[PDB]
Amino acid sequence: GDAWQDDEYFGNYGTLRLHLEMLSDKPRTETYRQVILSNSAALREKVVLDLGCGTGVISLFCALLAKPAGVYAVEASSMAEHTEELVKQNGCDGVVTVFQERAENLTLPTKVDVLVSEWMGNCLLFEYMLESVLLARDRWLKKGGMMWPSSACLTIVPCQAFSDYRQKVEFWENPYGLNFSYLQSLAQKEFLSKPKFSHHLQPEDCLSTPADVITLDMVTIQVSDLERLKGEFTFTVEKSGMFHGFTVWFSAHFQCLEEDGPSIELNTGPYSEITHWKQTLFMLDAPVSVEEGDIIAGSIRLQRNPIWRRHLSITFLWNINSTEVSTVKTKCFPMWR
Template sequence: MADKDSTQDTASDVYCVTSDYTARDPTQISLEAGDTVTVLEAVSDEWWWVEFIDKNDKPLVGYAPVNHLSKEIPLDEEDKWENSEYFSSYGQLKLHSEMLTDVPRTSTYSLAIQSALPWLQDKVVLDVGSGTGILSLFCARYGKPKKVYAVEASDIAVYSRETVSKNGYEDVIEVIQGNINDISLPHHQVDWIISEWMGTLLLFEFMIESVINARDKFLKPDGMIWPSEAELFLIPCSALSAYNGSMGIWKDVYGFDFSPYLSLAADTLTGKPIYNHTLSPDECLSEPFTILQLNMKTVTVSQLEDIRTAYDFLVKRSGMLHGFASYFTVHFSHLPHPHTPVTLSTSPQSKPTHWKQDLLLLDSPLQLEEGQRLKGTIKLTRHKLWRRHLRVTLTYSVWEDDTELNEAVTKIYRLWR
């Protein structure tokens, strides 16, 4: 690397970081894709001396690799959302078959809609991301609404429209193929929005933003939105088979020490959540901790960009900590008449759904003893460039009484970039 004193002067200029970079020595600066930096000096063809303002408004300076910087943000709005790839996947039957055959998911929506019968009659309903149209069909069958707008951006809308007609509901349900952000409705406001927007770690794919935008654009002030609330939980757990499949195999391969591969395995095999993981209740080492609560009538997009929560688990059962599992719960409430609350949960204690649970696997397991505490923080950060993507930063350490038994460990998980 060139010495900074031998650099050539250059005018201060703002550049976008196009891909992550982790500093390799104290003179360098770690950056994430989507950050912006001010170039102070063009040191060489490979390295520039830059200033970066962090989230606490603290200025940081250091070397950054030129091949990670671009004068222009390299993506247009369509690329940021990856809409062509995203909607293409929902234009195929595989995902819809998985959702329709998820009995707890689909039957819970059906039960919730039936619980709203007195209120739904003669109302205008908006189904956001309607897919095959099953939720719209439930509304038409049970609720006797005035109108249901089923909005779906993928090509599955063509078949959904035919299905609506085949079942005799074309006078009630109008299928609109398009992005919810771009369409208009004959009824400028609706009484009720319904959607199934939940993904990995509740938020992944960020369909929730489309629901929030639809709420702000179309929902009457006294209207309802279902699900009405959502919660995301975290729980420490044992997961021996998952750990052995990802990390344990590299410790001994036919009698050879393959430990040099462990750092690569930690990055490539445990650097992303293991989704659709089935967690047994007896693998849970503590009670769950609520890391996120959402009220769908009031949550804003800006509140979902960077979510940070401190946790403190009391270990209820001794065992090996291999990771943390997450699951979510959504509620169907806020009806203006008395009704039995309806809840859909993906917890290990509930009937399995297609979401199952998500596992954040550690690089190295820790032995926990009953009565100890597991403390740390979890941060969910929306990717600055790839807007459907999410990152999880997990910090953890073990405590006994007031003594920290190990130095806090931090690990980053990417969903998916």
């Protein structure tokens, strides 16, 4: 409710702006289309729950690209009223049923064989729609049923971010020949203490090979596991450069309904086609130069905000060519836009 900021959250999803962004994201939307196509024969006579269907696009993929026994399209925002009309104008109202309900207070006619949802936020967990997905899974997913995505993982890499640091911090040293360096302290707090959403990381700015640090198993994960997620990492710097911070993204995996089948992946990283999530940048307070062979090791922690339940803080701990504790640095980034 108020702790979930549901008025603002679902109010935003009642306008076309966010849905235009999702549907204009071709890698994202086509991935879900490909999952339905790759599993078309296996979906026949299955009951599908599309949790948070928005405009209903995923439900329409299920009803038009396969032959399920039924599709339950669930959407809590005011968009559901239009989704019902869209389903009917695409000739699917006999298979797709629209429920204008929250997953938490959901009443469905039957349990389901497949629960498909697009719940991933920035750095995977932001806004914690995953909680709603897990609650609907526990109540409505039949034993042996399929979660789509079936697993997800958080991936990070040490990176260079020259343009960001120069434009936001070093800029103040001599703009037009004026000494504005007195503002650099304020610039570090205002521009570097928060994550930068919609960062486009270039491959040449990666200082090492990216590593998966946290992996979520969508069948076994529980709501209580989401309060604090942690992963260790150790990076060998592969090219000499400037360590400005960490870039974070995620992947989502869609297991085939049949063991012998194709598994489909949605990757939001720098080596894949850009998505509306792009990547997320976490700047250090001060950059440090590094050379090939340097070891950057530590951990990342995603700590859910105890009061504002759609928010979290991301804490990096890292050490460069060292194991001691007096050398360890840490920075905590509140995840707010």
